[PDB]
């Protein structure tokens, strides 16, 4: 599976951020989005999106903190390779 393309984090405030991407080429059941404070290994929330969703708004983040977001395309048993980006509030 092809990973989501043109992933951009925009509209970042001290506590919120908007993640946007382009839908993968291949048909997929959904996208798994995982985000958390970059250097805290245990801080990882995963959201399962449906194939139709192309953006996700995150709130209640910590100010002046570096975060990492990772996205994977899914289709049954299969998953794409993860694509990751960092952003700072």
């Amino acid at each position: 599976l092809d990973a989501p393309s043109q992933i951009e984090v925009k509209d970042v405030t001290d506590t919120t951020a908007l993640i946007t991407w382009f839908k993968p080429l291949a048909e997929i059941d959904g996208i798994e989005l995982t985000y958390g404070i970059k250097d805290v290994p245990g801080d990882r929330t995963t959201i399962d999106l449906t194939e139709d969703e192309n953006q996700y708004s995150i709130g209640n983040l910590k100010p002046d903190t570096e975060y990492e977001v990772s996205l994977i395309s899914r289709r049954g048993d299969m998953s794409s390779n993860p694509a990751k980006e960092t952003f700072t509030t």
Side-chain angles (χ1 to χ4, degrees):
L1 285 166
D2 169 80
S5 188
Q6 202 176 205
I7 301 164
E8 299 180 323
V9 178
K10 309 164 191 185
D11 302 319
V12 179
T13 69
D14 283 88
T15 64
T16 67
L18 179 71
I19 315 306
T20 53
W21 53 90
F22 267 23
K23 178 179 182 160
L25 286 304
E27 165 247 58
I28 54 161
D29 312 332
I31 299 293
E32 294 185 1
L33 183 156
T34 300
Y35 67 93
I37 294 162
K38 193 178 190 65
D39 303 276
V40 174
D43 179 20
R44 295 301 177 256
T45 304
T46 299
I47 312 296
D48 302 331
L49 295 313
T50 44
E51 76 103 78
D52 46 281
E53 287 178 282
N54 98 286
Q55 69 176 52
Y56 191 68
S57 186
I58 307 175
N60 296 294
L61 301 174
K62 255 264 285 177
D64 181 41
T65 298
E66 192 166 57
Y67 280 82
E68 181 171 71
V69 296
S70 178
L71 287 85
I72 286 150
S73 299
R74 288 291 308 251
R75 190 203 294 130
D77 48 300
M78 293 177 290
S79 52
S80 64
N81 285 316
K84 299 170 168 144
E85 299 221 359
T86 297
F87 64 94
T88 187
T89 56

